[PDB]
Structure formats: structure tokens, C-alpha cells
Design a protein around this nucleic acid. Structure first.
Length: 55
DNA sequence: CAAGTGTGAGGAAAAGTAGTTGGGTTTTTTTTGCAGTTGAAGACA
């Protein structure tokens, strides 16, 4: 309530956007779209990093 | 052997006052949350 009324902050702490999905949109299509929009960082795919510094 | 004028000081004491000190206040003139904002360096056409 403070984040709205008191500060009218243009930076919500947890900004969310709700998306209605068409009646025709399957649940499986919906999970595909959920994957399709979410961000994927390069870190998120790395398993191990080995640096062999030789000098 | 003796009696008789003139007279200077020595002495005492309670309270005060000295010396030496101190006390004594008096009197005294280690960010722990927040959101915003400016100015800055840097950068651009």
C-alpha cells in the first residue's frame, strides 16, 4: 500500500504483467510459450569452467 | 652603723592575630532505511 499510495513508485519491487491465453490455446502450447518468453542467461547453461592460466 | 627620697622594669594572660596549608566549591567565559536530488565524468553529432 505504501508502494502505491505513498510513493507512486515507477519501480515496483515485483512488477508483473498478467497475460490471458486464448480459449484455443492449449495447456501444452501454454507451457511452450512459458519457456519461449522466459529469459535464459548464459550462466544458466554452463556446467563447468576450467581456466588453465599458463605463463 | 644606720634610716630615709627618687624611681624602671619585670611580669602575666585571654583573646586576637600571625604563618603555613589546604580545601573548596566557587565561579565561568561505531549506518542502522529511506527516496529523492545536484553536480559530476563521460560521452555524442
Amino acid at each position: 500500500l505504501r508502494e502505491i499510495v505513498m510513493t507512486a513508485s515507477a519501480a515496483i519491487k515485483t512488477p508483473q504483467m498478467t497475460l490471458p491465453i486464448w480459449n484455443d490455446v492449449s495447456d501444452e502450447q501454454a507451457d511452450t510459450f512459458c519457456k519461449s518468453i522466459s529469459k535464459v542467461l548464459l550462466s544458466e547453461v554452463i556446467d563447468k569452467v576450467i581456466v588453465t592460466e599458463t605463463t
